Symmetry: C3
Subunit: 191 residues, 3 copies
């Protein structure tokens, strides 16, 4: 099965993706931004050295590279988990990480939204910052509801599932959010 | 005029449909799930005996059946009211009840959402059971999701979105149903 | 750059536009409705005299005029700010202000939503009425729907969505308008 996994940045989605790769066999865990970076270096070796360079390209070339990455993802395997972002916040507002072509190509069975509590997100982002912009509770609640609207739109267009995993409850022990999300996702795949 | 009527399950949408079919003339009402069941028995008698059997079909066959059902619905009359669901909850998440083909075929003038209070929905669902047990948060989510789905379908197909508020407390039983029927009629005979 | 500016009616969206047109160089601010009205009197003088007369035209004629106006707007300038409405309320429900052709023609970089507090909007509308009546909940709904419409357009046409918050209390009159103008300018000169 194929699921696009998303959440607000730095909340622990990458932790879940890396931890999913160990526990599931014949499951592909892949980060969309990374494939975009690789194909951008391949097609524009001259310009692209750091992964921030994808910002600078012309939007037509960047969209072409997004399509190429969607193709590379499209044939990988049977079980896929695509780690990307419904939307990223910029000075000009929110911008979608996916283009319609990406979904048409990957043909995902579903979209998964990891919804955390804003306090946990702030504390986790500061924890990771200390280990190596500071948004407010309201900024993050917004970001999450907007991710929700984006996924529902993508579902209405491509007829795929919308699965909202709740991780807003208080942690009884550190890393319980990650474990619960991993277990729900696994439970979901092997149904 | 043509309106797709939706709400969360077991909330009283079917009652409103029955009462509209009674009070309204020159308007024919239909249940999408029932037509899907009929065409599934028609095209696949081997498998389809109960209306839950549609689950077992390959998704390609089920989509073909939805297409055929939409064709008959679109032809059925001039004024329509189609009882369907914006989205249904499954172990894999929410899934839209409509596919784009259904809307392109029926070309509804609008979509109508009956939005209830979760407490009313819980009490009504248990009342009907006596004649899964979701929580207030589950139901608020489901309805907000119905909202997003309807607005998306509107942006794509350039159609109306009418949200009927029934979250206020009932002064007498069956006032929600009455108010909804009256608003829908008022809207139709404009 | 091209931004479609939206908000609920009579909340001060037009004031933000007028003050921006005053403050920004090489910036043209234009109202979609006004171009629609002008081309409607030009092309259909018989029916169109007051700007409400746009109501009476056939929806085909109204759409053709919308296309002609969107053509004119995209043609009209370099730096643009288009004053419109994500959605308008009608007896049949909410209906979107933009058509797909409008966006394809204008190719806006983004959408901007001025989101107010319902009390501020109501009080501002009564202020404007007295100078020459929805409920708080009606307006919260209208705005959540505006939001959903903008997000849908965003997914379909890959444009920005900027939500400017004006629901805090005004410490002095015209602070909402001033803050919005400043945020938008800061955004433009990035
Ligand atoms: Cl019902
Ligand atoms: Cl205004």
């Amino acid at each position: 099965m194929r699921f696009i996994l998303t959440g607000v940045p730095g909340a622990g989605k990458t932790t879940v993706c890396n931890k999913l790769a160990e526990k599931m066999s014949n499951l592909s865990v892949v980060n969309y931004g990374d494939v975009i970076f690789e194909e951008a270096k391949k097609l524009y070796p001259s310009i692209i050295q750091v992964r921030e360079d994808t910002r600078k390209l012309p939007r037509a070339d960047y969209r072409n590279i997004q399509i190429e990455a969607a193709k590379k993802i499209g044939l990988i395997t049977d079980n896929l988990i695509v780690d990307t972002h419904m939307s990223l916040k910029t000075p000009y507002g929110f911008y979608p990480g996916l283009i319609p072509e990406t979904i048409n190509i990957i043909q995902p069975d579903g979209i998964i939204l990891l919804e955390f509590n804003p306090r946990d997100v702030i504390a986790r982002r500061e924890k990771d910052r200390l280990a190596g912009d500071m948004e407010s509770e309201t900024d993050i609640l917004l970001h999450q509801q907007v991710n929700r609207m984006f996924a529902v739109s993508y579902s209405a267009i491509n007829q795929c599932y919308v699965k909202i995993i709740d991780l807003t409850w208080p942690q009884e022990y550190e890393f319980q959010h990650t474990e619960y999300a991993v277990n729900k996702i696994i439970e979901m795949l092997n149904f």
